[PDB]
Amino acid sequence: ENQNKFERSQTKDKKLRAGLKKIDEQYKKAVSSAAATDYLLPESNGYLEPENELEKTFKVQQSEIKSSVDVSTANKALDLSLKEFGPYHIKYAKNGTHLLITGRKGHVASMDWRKGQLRAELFLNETCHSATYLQNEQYFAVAQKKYTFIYDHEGTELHRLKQHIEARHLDFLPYHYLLVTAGETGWLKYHDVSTGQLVSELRTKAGPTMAMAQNPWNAVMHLGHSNGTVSLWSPSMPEPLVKLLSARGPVNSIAIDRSGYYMATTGADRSMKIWDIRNFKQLHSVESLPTPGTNVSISDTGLLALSRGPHVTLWKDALKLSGDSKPCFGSMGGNPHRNTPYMSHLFAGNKVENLGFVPFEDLLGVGHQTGITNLIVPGAGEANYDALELNPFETKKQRQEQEVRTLLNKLPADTITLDPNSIGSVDKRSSTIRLNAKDLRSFLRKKTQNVIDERKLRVQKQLDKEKNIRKRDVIEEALSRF
Amino acid sequence: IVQQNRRADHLIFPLNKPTEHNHASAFTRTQDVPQTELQEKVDQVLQESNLANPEKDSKFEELARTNAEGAIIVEEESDGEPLQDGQNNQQDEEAKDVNPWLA
Amino acid sequence: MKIKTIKRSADDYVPVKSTQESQMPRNLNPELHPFERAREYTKALNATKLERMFAKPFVGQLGYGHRDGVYAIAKNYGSLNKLATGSADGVIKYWNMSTREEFVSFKAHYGLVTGLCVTQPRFHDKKPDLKSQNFMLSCSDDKTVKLWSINVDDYSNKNNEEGLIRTFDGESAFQGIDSHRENSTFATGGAKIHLWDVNRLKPVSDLSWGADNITSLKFNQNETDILASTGSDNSIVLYDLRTNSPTQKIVQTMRTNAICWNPMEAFNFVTANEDHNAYYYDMRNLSRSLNVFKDHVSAVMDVDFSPTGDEIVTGSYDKSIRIYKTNHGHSREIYHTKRMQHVFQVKYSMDSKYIISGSDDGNVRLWRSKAWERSNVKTTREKNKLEYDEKLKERFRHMPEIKRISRHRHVPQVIKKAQEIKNIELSSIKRREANERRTRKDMPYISERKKQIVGTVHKYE
Amino acid sequence: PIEYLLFEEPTGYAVFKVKLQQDDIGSRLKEVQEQINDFGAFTKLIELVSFAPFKGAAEALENANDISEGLVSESLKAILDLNLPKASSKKKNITLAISDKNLGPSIKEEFPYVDCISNELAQDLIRGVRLHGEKLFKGLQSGDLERAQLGLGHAYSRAKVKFSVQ
Amino acid sequence: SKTRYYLEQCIPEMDDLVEKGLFTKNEVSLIMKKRTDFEHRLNSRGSSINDYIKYINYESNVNKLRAKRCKRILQVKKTNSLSDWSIQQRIGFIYQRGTNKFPQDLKFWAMYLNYMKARGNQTSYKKIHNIYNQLLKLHPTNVDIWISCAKYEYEVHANFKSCRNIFQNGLRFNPDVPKLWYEYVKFELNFITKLINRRKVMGLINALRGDIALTIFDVCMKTLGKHYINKHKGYYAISDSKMNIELNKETLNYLFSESLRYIKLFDEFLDLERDYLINHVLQFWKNDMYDLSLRKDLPELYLKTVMIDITLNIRYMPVEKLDIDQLQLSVKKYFAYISKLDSASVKSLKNEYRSYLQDNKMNAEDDKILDLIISKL
RNA sequence: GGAAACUCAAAGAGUGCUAUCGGAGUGCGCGAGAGCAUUUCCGGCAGCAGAUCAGCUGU
């Protein structure tokens, strides 16, 4: 019933036939006994249902959902409204514990939010573009004016970066301990934050990087230029790994599902595209949205969210392959075969700056001009985190244990292709029928070396000539043999 | 036997039938001789007059109006005063008889 | 309108008391565990690096060694920690390997001792008192085969007949023995092979093909009534005591030093000869050596199977021992030390984890077979970690960088240089064979598993 | 083959089933003979399966005198008759890791199907259970060991001296 | 962990428990998270038998609810699936784990034994023998263990050879409690009465005296005397004449206080050669130990032996005319002892007069007689 | 300068804490099973009936 989520995509020798039966039987048994775990999964996800026809799902606002929601989630529904520094920006941590906010004037605050524990506030006097955590509460990087800084957990300036000549799109590849930077110059550079080494400096050659997302599933970096090109990169090849034509003009935002399959992308020509990634098929377009949506994000369940400046619009289940789950904007003519906004919120006069879904709770954080606001959204959070990797109930001991284990299991930087299941194969020299060899005075020294080299060349030429030799009218018939 | 010894998936090396004996329960005398003086005196008394299932089967090989309601206390007394091996053999024999007459 | 939102509730996740263990809630989704193959690859690479970090194979000597280099080692088969070593100036010793000391010593003979083995010898006019004293017998080249008791505190049942229970004496010399493990019979080799039992001073039977000496023998480990031997006509002979006769004979290209049966197949044996490769024969078809283990540089002085039935220990005339698996045909790995010269006798112990090697310097050293598995009883999460990353190394052993980490050793410079020149000689002779096969037309593709056999009585059936 | 162990203690007799085995060949190694010292691995190796306390003080003195001359007594023979299984002659005879070769023949005389053993493996296994002491017994007693062994020692000393208390 | 392993092993019962419609997914996730918390509390660092008890209570109540929803929804009793024996298998695992991790609490041991005796219809007496033998091994001293499952082996299976075997094993294990000896005599008399009733049932449908009880009485007397003496005099055999003699008088007093309890709850038993084995008791207490106490200390004890030896007959009849008919024997022995005693004569006179007063025509005249006339007329 | 540690964070040592189809029968193994496996009573239903079980009634 659930084995598609857990699925991982005639011989002569009798012992090899039995071994193949054993290994694919073990594959089937392990997939079934892994799929029988969601019976033991701890809790169920959330939902708001229409339960009628007049009760639409997007005529529901924060007052009634905060009334009929839990007290703990209602008190999680924060508003850290700050006005003396500029249009704010969000990044929650990898687990949903810490929050990192950034004003465009000078403000950078890294803080718990379910506890009132402000653990690193720092003002500056230069425009801080964005910011993101590295692995923990411990180290967080800010893409400042013209040098990216990384900071300790209390606020001491750990490192200016000599490289990264400027920066406006910066995030982290977690299992590799990589920091990825894209700036207003045509660069994209990788800096490992464990060894401290730079890894690659990929010249983009496509103008300034307008937007960027990260794929979680294979750690490729998704740039989006002013050409409308969505390119995907990795530090193997200096060329872009693939390119896409998403929108026309520039693309202002791009966001990847956590399963790596789906890509949402919103341009500047009032256009949105939904893409498959593993087949690169444009799934469905969305036109007719009134203003070019500046930032799109995507939940952990498929519940995406456009952010058109004053509006934020959340569509539930708009990533199927059908033509029904195309995200529309209004039910016309009595048509229940559309996809209206699952819900929506309209802020007053402040343009929303960026989104971000809280990882393991049911709320969408959005940052704008006057500060932060979280939105209670019932299905837009993964309910049941897995405690061996992410954990919203850490201690010091297990935080240091996860630090030392992931630093021991740092995947090397070469191992991020387009498909990370492709490191076990043979190297494109397959030979399915494998030919296993069964079924086929210094002048004088140099001169003698040249003699032996010329003899080896002549023997090679004669063996190839013999190989080619082995692998290959009346009056002239009378006048043959001469 | 060596051929299917190289087709099996995990070989747990106690291969043959090992020493797997149940522990000396308190119900069974181990070496079948009196150890203590109490065992000495009680067995030298009980050498002569013991119900070693022979008199039990001979006096319990009995068990219709008596089956319905006439011997409603006599059958209870007989089935109560029946001993262990006599009761087990009676249960097995009556179960086999009911298996023959009710299939 | 019906709404809901997930409830962490902070009691089924963080505990109520202090001492109980917090929950590790669990979701087995390939969404939430993204990099499967690269992460288990890097766990395999860390497994290989940690195995190289813990590759500490040597465990100890025992005693101060013998006088002048061992030449025969006999493990017993009932108990675990008892091991007899016979050495060159007629000195046999019976070691308790637990405390790594010797029980008793004997000036056993005058000349070179040649072969010893232990027996639980059932006499007919005496009960086998084999839970209080243990019996070993030893043949030398001064025409004597002595059978000895040993007082041993393996048990504590009793409370005196220490040594030299009896002495069989032979016409010619003697070259080796082994004891048939049932019914107190033992066979020797010398001028021709003889079969004694311990109730006679004279040989019960004589079982040669012709008048040719026999270098070594070995009985089975099951189907005990047959045995094999090797003589300096470069020949492997089999014998069957049920028919009381020799039964087949192959002749290889060089002299077989030490044969050894398999204690789990009962019809396969390994064969260690002076050409530098231990052959592995199937008995009931002796036309093809169904494996050949081909990594030494000098004469292959001894081999033995582990009682788990799949690992081969071998010890060369060059100063090195190797451990093979049966199913591969090349070396798993190699031990060596500066202070051992010319290892002449190697034996697995019955624990199947410790190989007893005996050099010519005098010492009887010991080694762990798995050079990284320690011997303590480990906790269950540690045993899970060890078996899991060992299975990862086994599954990923074909990747090139963890192959080039898991393969290399510090092979001593003598063995490395001589194996390098042997490799360039073999490549040169293969090139000349390719030229000759480029010319000629009637040239058989001679199989490597049948390269060394040059003759078989009872040719084909 | 060490599968039952007998320990004698100044509150009572204990008999331990040996769950898994000790490494015999490497039994002088550091990484094996620190496992006897630490506790988290010794209870992987030895569990308590019987503990009968002699309760009379004079019967404790009498058991101590019979052990100290190397002779079986009523309580020891009682718990071995209870705990030690009749290993039938098809399989083997049972083994018992006792502390001394003076005691050995006197249990082999009385029980035929038992087989005593004291090599250095039984020596350091009994040493490990002596070191860990009370924490093996998991609460099957009423009274600590040291005051009881103080009284038993003074009584055994006076019974050896036959000291005139007049 | 291993808590993950136990929780993952309990998944197929909820699998078929939802596959048949008697439990939907919401409440089965509810019981699974409750069992998750209970099982981590069970496998904590320093858990408790209270936690084992209440987890067992949770599993028994979810079993009762599963049977109730089975007889309500599917309207069948046994679903012939994995869903039926799984909860009892888990309760067996929890009781085995609790008796391994906490072996000194007989309350928990007894709850395991009562649960297994109740489920003997599904899993027979071999598991009873196994857990009871390991209980006997881990607690040889506590005599209530032997008494309880000897009562089990006699009243549920009635296998007298194994019953006498475990009584003799326990009596070898601690021959210094009075209770085990006395209840062994009680079981031995129950067996001999059931055997004589078998003989009477043979006679109804138309040798073996109390020598077993008398021999175990004799070994009871000498062994409880010796071990009471060794319970006193702790480490050093006390060596002074009057102290040794007075402690011999003390153990004579305690030993006769046990023998009178034997006479009491044998007179409640009697139905047999009651005067035969009571006179064996009194022949032993005539032929005394360490002191020969008839002319020595405890003369009140000597008077009580004389009183029992005289009033041996009178303790059985409601028809006291037979007591007056045979009272010539009682008053004849009474005169034979009054002729020997002087002030114990007076106390014995008061005792016999109180006995006849508790008791109360031609024999009442001829063969005291004042009370005999006052009861006859 | 003395430091209240009850504001919190990063760390270092010492101490203590756990294990790895169901009862019989039936061809069966040396008072006896640790298992090989079922159409045999079965684990279908209620009633007599000694107090949720022992003997039966059909099915």
Swiss-Prot record, chain A:
GO terms for cellular component: 90S preribosome; nucleolus; nucleoplasm; preribosome, small subunit precursor; small-subunit processome. Pfam families: BING4CT, WD40. Keywords: Nucleus, Repeat, Ribonucleoprotein, Ribosome biogenesis, rRNA processing, WD repeat. Residues 1-8 have a biased composition (Basic and acidic residues). WD repeats lie at residues 82-123, 204-243, 246-285, 288-325. The keyword Chaperone does not apply. SUPFAM superfamilies: WD40 repeat-like. Its main location: nucleus. It comes from the Eukaryota. One of its GO terms (biological process) is maturation of SSU-rRNA from tricistronic rRNA transcript (SSU-rRNA, 5.8S rRNA, LSU-rRNA). InterPro entries: BING4_C_dom (IPR012952), WD40/YVTN_repeat-like_dom_sf (IPR015943), WD40_repeat_CS (IPR019775), WD40_repeat_dom_sf (IPR036322), WD40_rpt (IPR001680), WDR46/Utp7 (IPR040315). It is found in: Nucleus, Nucleolus. Involved in nucleolar processing of pre-18S ribosomal RNA. Present with 5800 molecules/cell in log phase SD medium. Interacts with snoRNA U3. Interacts with MPP10. Component of the ribosomal small subunit (SSU) processome composed of at least 40 protein subunits and snoRNA U3. This is U3 small nucleolar RNA-associated protein 7. The gene is UTP7.
Curated annotation (Swiss-Prot), chain B:
Involved in nucleolar processing of pre-18S ribosomal RNA. This is U3 small nucleolar RNA-associated protein 14. Interacts with snoRNA U3. Interacts with MPP10. Component of the ribosomal small subunit (SSU) processome composed of at least 40 protein subunits and snoRNA U3. Present with 1470 molecules/cell in log phase SD medium. Belongs to the UTP14 family. It is found in: Nucleus, Nucleolus. Coiled coil: none annotated. It comes from the Eukaryota.
From Swiss-Prot, chain D:
Belongs to the NOP5/NOP56 family. It is found in: Nucleus, Nucleolus. One of its GO terms (cellular component) is nucleoplasm. The keyword Lipid metabolism does not apply. Transmembrane segments: none annotated. The keyword Ribonucleoprotein applies. Its main location: nucleus. It comes from the Eukaryota. Interacts with NOP1 and NOP58. Component of the ribosomal small subunit (SSU) processome composed of at least 40 protein subunits and snoRNA U3. GO terms for biological process: box C/D sno(s)RNA 3'-end processing; maturation of SSU-rRNA; rRNA modification; rRNA processing; snoRNA guided rRNA 2'-O-methylation. The gene is NOP56. One of its GO terms (molecular function) is mRNA binding. Keywords: Nucleus, Phosphoprotein, Ribonucleoprotein, Ribosome biogenesis. This is Nucleolar protein 56. Present with 13500 molecules/cell in log phase SD medium. The chain holds residues 3 to 168 of 504 of the full protein. Coiled coil: none annotated. Required for 60S ribosomal subunit synthesis.
UniProtKB/Swiss-Prot annotation, chain E:
The keyword Ribonucleoprotein applies. Keywords: Nucleus, Repeat, Ribonucleoprotein, Ribosome biogenesis, rRNA processing. One of its GO terms (cellular component) is Pwp2p-containing subcomplex of 90S preribosome. Belongs to the UTP6 family. Component of the ribosomal small subunit (SSU) processome, or 90S pre-ribosomal particle, composed of the 35S pre-rRNA precursor, the U3 snoRNA, and at least 40 protein subunits. Component of the PWP2/UTP-B subcomplex composed of DIP2, PWP2, UTP6, UTP13, UTP18 and UTP21. Interacts with U3 snoRNA. Interacts with MPP10. It is found in: Nucleus, Nucleolus. Disulfide bonds: none annotated. HAT repeats lie at residues 86-118, 123-155, 158-190. GO terms for biological process: endonucleolytic cleavage in 5'-ETS of tricistronic rRNA transcript (SSU-rRNA, 5.8S rRNA, LSU-rRNA); endonucleolytic cleavage in ITS1 to separate SSU-rRNA from 5.8S rRNA and LSU-rRNA from tricistronic rRNA transcript (SSU-rRNA, 5.8S rRNA, LSU-rRNA); endonucleolytic cleavage to generate mature 5'-end of SSU-rRNA from (SSU-rRNA, 5.8S rRNA, LSU-rRNA); maturation of SSU-rRNA; maturation of SSU-rRNA from tricistronic rRNA transcript (SSU-rRNA, 5.8S rRNA, LSU-rRNA). InterPro entries: HAT, TPR-like_helical_dom_sf, Utp6, UTP6_N. Its main location: nucleus. Component of the SSU processome, a pre-ribosomal particle required for the maturation of the 18S rRNA from the 35S pre-rRNA precursor. This is U3 small nucleolar RNA-associated protein 6. It comes from the Eukaryota. It holds the Pfam family U3_assoc_6.
